[PDB]
Design a protein around this ligand. Sequence first.
Ligand SMILES: [Zn+2]
Length: 213
Amino acid sequence: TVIKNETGTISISQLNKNVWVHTELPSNGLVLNTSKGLVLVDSSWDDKLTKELIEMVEKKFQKRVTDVIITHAHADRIGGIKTLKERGIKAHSTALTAELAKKNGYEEPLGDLQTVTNLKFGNMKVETFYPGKGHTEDNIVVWLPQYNILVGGCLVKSTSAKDLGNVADAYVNEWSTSIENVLKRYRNINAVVPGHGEVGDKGLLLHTLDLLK
Ligand SMILES: [Zn+2]
């Protein structure tokens, strides 16, 4: 299914039940329909878009957003940390992400995740994994054990991606090893959600490795 706000669209497309995708204007993220509330992988550009998304989601799902997992300290992922914060929503991040958000003048996320972290939200089991530097020093990936769904963030580029994008903060040299790391840990990947663009499969990890050489 596909549901949208109105202009400066926010849209929720659906993967399996319980797993939807949130994208705002494009930047992607996840909405996990869990027994213990709604869990979000990444907020959005800013407070407005994150405030609107939270509101559209609690409405449809008749449930409160309780947790959010930030994949890296750049605006598109950490823009609404003030909203999450004031609202009592748990913003998870690795320690680096948090100190980087701090360094850039943002509310500090939890800095609670370690290299590999296994979270559990009711039925939902979520695995966070720091594969290494790539698009950004702190970028982590999210893996849903029960669906073989990988949220690759900006470490992974969509089919339509013909360049790496903003490489200002990137580690182009480590980047390929990092993606190799994901591929070694995650054999049999059903769907891969990029930080921007269309959702695809393992092929997306290979496309990016191609944009690296
Ligand atoms: Zn970024």
